[PDB]
From a paper:
Here we investigate the mechanism of fast inactivation in the Shaker Kv channel using cryo-electron microscopy, mass spectrometry and electrophysiology. We resolved structures of a fully inactivated state in which the non-polar end of the N terminus plugs the internal pore in an extended conformation. The N-terminal methionine is deleted, leaving an alanine that is acetylated and interacts with a pore-lining isoleucine residue where RNA editing regulates fast inactivation. Opening of the internal activation gate is required for fast inactivation because it enables the plug domain to block the pore and repositions gate residues to interact with and stabilize that domain.
Analysis of this construct using mass spectrometry revealed cleavage of the N-terminal Met and acetylation of Ala2. We reconstituted purified AcA-EI Shaker into liposomes, injected those into oocytes and observed that the kinetics for the onset of inactivation were indeed faster than for the WT channel. The cryo-EM map for AcA-EI Shaker with additional N-terminal peptide also has continuous density between V4 and V474 and P475 in S6, and between A5 and those same two residues in the S6 of another subunit, suggesting that those interactions stabilize the inactivated state. First, the structures of GT Shaker and AcA-EI Shaker with free peptide show the sidechain of N482 in the S6 helix directed towards the N-terminal inactivation particle near Y8 at the innermost end of the pore. The only charged residues resolved in our structures are those at positions 12 and 13, which in the WT protein are Glu and Asp and in our AcA-EI Shaker construct have been mutated to Lys. The density for these two residues in both GT Shaker and AcA-EI Shaker with additional free peptide are relatively strong, positioning them outside the pore within the chamber, consistent with mutations at these positions altering association rate between the N terminus and the pore through long-range electrostatic interactions without altering the stability of the inactivated state20.
Author numbering:
A (entry chain H): 12 to 20
B (entry chain D), C (entry chain C): 84 to 91, 96 to 194, 216 to 252, 277 to 298, 310 to 327, 357 to 489
D (entry chain B): 84 to 91, 96 to 194, 216 to 252, 277 to 298, 310 to 327, 357 to 488
E (entry chain A): 84 to 91, 96 to 193, 216 to 252, 277 to 298, 310 to 327, 357 to 489
F (entry chain G): 2 to 13
The structure:
């Protein structure tokens, strides 16, 4: 979980 | 569903700062208006020497822009760039107000405001709400007119704020003052003195987190219903099992399946029933199974609500 | 395993809307049929002026299409585009029904319908199931013909529905009606009265979420077995430790190691045992270790189960 | 907000090992200094044969470099390359000390440093802290000069360390020794003998993980406050509900709503109250609802704190 | 740290199925051997008509392959392709066994079960389960017949151990040491307790148990952090609850250590049971203890969870 | 259980 993480994009 | 163009008039080349794009003119003809749709807004970018269209802008983001023409109505942001840069890219070509709006969803009266003079009004309302809650809790105490005066002052402030203001916020404001005027079979009295607690929900107007929680509940009502259904099924099953474990035993701990219902709950939620000795071996096995199944059936639905709350909380900030 | 062609007949160029691809004809001739596999379906896209194949479609998704030819049978969607674009991307070239189907796995009869006259039957069935559950839980009460008539009406409805209909749903329907006909040693009677509760599982036919839970359990049987095994190991170890901590003290709280099993359980799942005073310091240390290890062992395997539930829930919607 | 250039003098081509980039010179001259900003530092890479700029480096990472000129101040790392290659690539062109620094935020005196054989001092300090904690706990026992001597030795060591040393660490160091010197109504005495426990926080200077916990608390104070607010709302609501469910029954289990508060807590956190029999059916329903809502309100805000702690721990 | 080449002999062009790459020959000369490092293994791919290097393979994976030449020793897989294709791409160019191992790091029938030892294993599992059952049953109050089965199990265990001849062997030795010991009562109690270690022999036959052991070995640090946090919380909250109740007659807690257990069953949400004789301040301290316990358990455990998940998926 | 969290799969 990060900012603009691979899960989100 | 969208329509894609098919080949066989003339082909054109688009040079997005060295990345050459070649498409049929019919594809550019598909969407009227727009910078690239009509010659009027794109003639300035034509290069007479090279017969090419030059757009000295971001190269990786032009693929989605071309795919809009390619797919004829589909705009999806590729996962290689932040949303900030892509928002500016679509504005450059002016794809259309409807197109941009569709992608947006893809991801006195001074009281309802926040100014220098509205802040004191808000803090006064918060203090009054907290005072009303405190007076409620203390008037329920066994040690106890002095409470009635504070209660009626809070009610006058609440109704004054409601009248000045005039969804769900107004409904909560109304319900917070209905019971006071109701007082002006003891079951109805108990119900109204219970619904007096709804004044605590007036903090939603002044707390940002509480509104986030409300939005999360509204979004995940389906998951809440699924969790309640799973809990009900588990409670019924394990109550039946634990009752029939002691059915053949004398001096049964559980008189009936509904009696065991509470027990099942405090085992599915891992709260704990307390005294557990008079239960035999089979009841203990059923209890262990109930504990495991409760852990599972609580851990399954919650993460969806967790994700909804996280999304709402991070979208707020 | 897949076979990749090796170089040294003639080379051809593929132009995906400006993105030039060069590939040996032997690689293109590996796969028969298909838009590019045979000259019949790809001569229409030939450009006599430039001797090039022009494909005015999505640039980024052609890499996987060529890699399917390159690897000679290996096709995987790169993580740069959504699934909708890639699904339609393959249909353009018609790589083959078997190739597309293989990629899909990579990611009267008036009752089983949704007609206007079928929803009433479904609502009657679910109402009857709920009524049967209620009648069961009320007939088990100490305060109690009136229940037998309702039970036999529910059984008649269940048998009528089963006969009209005529996996696992049919097994559940059979089990929900076996015990009533069975009644027409006390251990067998207790077992049949217990298995009567399986009528609650008939809601799976009408509940979408319950089928999702069943599919999740079927998928994660292995993780469930792992969790049960870990629980058994922990229970045995900690029950033995806590029993041997009180071996040397008179009036031992635990008479034997099996006697302690229940305690261990309600400490691993954090349910709680209740009274804990007659336990010495070593027993308390063992209990603290048991609580920590139980938290860890119940936390370890459930991510997989909840991820499977998430996947099934999202696939359903 | 950032400003981007607009077209209409001469355009140039950049060849990043075969990936040709064509950009307007006005874009290149937007940022002074830098390898590409001035002709002095970029004439070396010019190719007279083809009039092209050759930069034999990582192709995928040049898009961010050009976009920085394109956006005129916005430099964002695309998610296609590791952090190591991007940090080295930007240093090649010397984008600017302020520019690189801005991107960094996007993602005796022997005691403080445990080097030069001073780790012995640290282990002695840890041993003294543990001994002080043990002596405190043992002196609270009913079975009990021998404790006072050890306690005052620990206090002398603590004050010697604090004085030779001379933030939150210093505040904790001072608080760990205030109560001993204070003792040289009984409510104040109870408060000081309670705050004497703050010597356990002295391990912060030596334990790396506890500093991570402190940083996580500082970062997620807002989420902790939100969790406390949710718990308070739920406790008040369910305490009122359960109390009013027992109003009409004689020998009520809960005498008042505040009395029920504690119960609500042990049902919201799923700890357990214990004896629960004298509660009627309505109270049992309220308790089940309280347990479920407590599970919900505990599970909602804890992932943020968990993520913050994980990020800090794995960054350390 | 790795070395990158610097410009000024002749530059060569690489055509990866239409994706043109241009690099300095010195960059390819940096690594000896390899398909592209030496002319012997790459002259076959030369195109005399175009003077180009043609490599009809996956285009997106050549960026990392070239970056290995570019970085002079750093090979990182970009997030655009699965790991299966990258392993095939690197094998084509034969970068080097040492280089590929970097990404790699990124009678006697008992171990290898082959048909007949597929039974021996089931007999061993059955014997282990039987020994556990005999242990638990002989601890019952109602109970030679148990000793015979115990000695048969020990005979089988020692036969297997001596035929076989890490940690599995250590556990096997421990599972039979106490039986041979029997051939102050504190030592007797200790050996009868350590007799339970026979339950760990299932590690040889259970795949999940080995995964759990590997997870513990990997996350020993996180386990220690969790234990430290729990200890700090227990000490703090036990001291607080003791001092919140010392001033009342007939105090529930006699001393801070006496409260330790309570603190534990409040941090882990197990529950203590009876809670009435504690006053308002004790109840507030207990609520704070419960909340802090939820936080301190939810903080480090997910790291161990992540380690276990990774090991479980790596096994399968 | 109050964890109810997946998070990143972990190191490599
Ligand atoms: K509990
Ligand atoms: K619990």
């Amino acid at each position: 979980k990060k900012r603009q993480h691979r899960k989100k994009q």
